Amino acid sequence: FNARRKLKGAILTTMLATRNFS
Amino acid sequence: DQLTEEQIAEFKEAFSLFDKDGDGTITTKELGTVMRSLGQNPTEAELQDMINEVDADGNGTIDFPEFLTMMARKMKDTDSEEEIREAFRVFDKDGNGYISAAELRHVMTNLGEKLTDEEVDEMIREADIDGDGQVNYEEFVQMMT
Ligand SMILES: [Ca+2]
Ligand SMILES: [Ca+2]
Ligand SMILES: [Ca+2]
Ligand SMILES: [Ca+2]
Ligand SMILES: [Zn+2]
Ligand SMILES: [Zn+2]
Ligand SMILES: [Zn+2]
Ligand SMILES: [Zn+2]
Ligand SMILES: [Zn+2]
């Protein structure tokens, strides 16, 4: 289990969602 | 500087969080799901513009190459320190300035990821530099920089 990839991927997804997919 | 290999992997995990049916593409429906679950409330109209702006071929959906091109630009974002703070606030549900494991479990569950309590505690440990058992702003910024 890559805990760092899972977390950073999720936070990147959250960054995208808060800036209207940009 | 360049797009390193691990960064690509991180981007791949981001992509898969959107690409809910795992069919290689992000639709407006999939994008809508995710944003709704992260507390954003866009309209069908807005969603369609969001796809279009990074659909640089024009077939109505987004594949990983298109996603990657955006993610590449976002790597040199001037508004980056602020974009990270905003994401932090999505995770930090009580506004107390630390992300607990419960808070992280909530977001992860909302994104449609099914995790064990150990898998969650492992992600917290990844970022928890000061050993308090939860991720604060500075640690969050550190990890994402
Ligand atoms: Ca899909
Ligand atoms: Ca396309
Ligand atoms: Ca909190
Ligand atoms: Ca900590
Ligand atoms: Zn836009
Ligand atoms: Zn930006
Ligand atoms: Zn500010
Ligand atoms: Zn636990
Ligand atoms: Zn383990």
Question: Where do we find the tokens 């999505």?
Answer: B90
Per DSSP, B22 falls in state -
Instruction: Tell me which residues of chain B, numbers 4 to 63, contact chain A at a CB-CB cutoff of 8 Å.
Output: 6, 9-14, 16-18, 31, 34-35, 38, 40, 42, 46, 50-51, 53-54
Q: Which alpha helices (H) appear in chain B, and where do they start and end? A: 5-18, 28-37, 44-53, 64-74, 80-91, 101-110, 117-127, 137-143
Distance CA B27, CA B55 (A): 11
Distance CA B75, CA B97 (A): 25
Distance CA B35, CA B40 (A): 5
Buried/exposed A1-22: b ≥16 CB within 10 Å, e otherwise: eebbbbbbbbbbbbbbbbbebe
Q: How was this structure determined?
A: X-ray
Question: Where do we find the tokens 């064990």?
Answer: B116
Which residues in chain A touch residue B46, judged by CB atoms under 8 angstroms apart? 20
**Helix (H/G/I), strand (E/B), else coil: B135:** strand
Sorted by sequence, the CB contacts under 8 Å of residue B72 that are 6+ apart come out as B3
Helical (H) or strand (E) element with B94? none
Distance CA B94, CA B88 (A): 11
Resolution given for this structure, in angstroms: 2.7
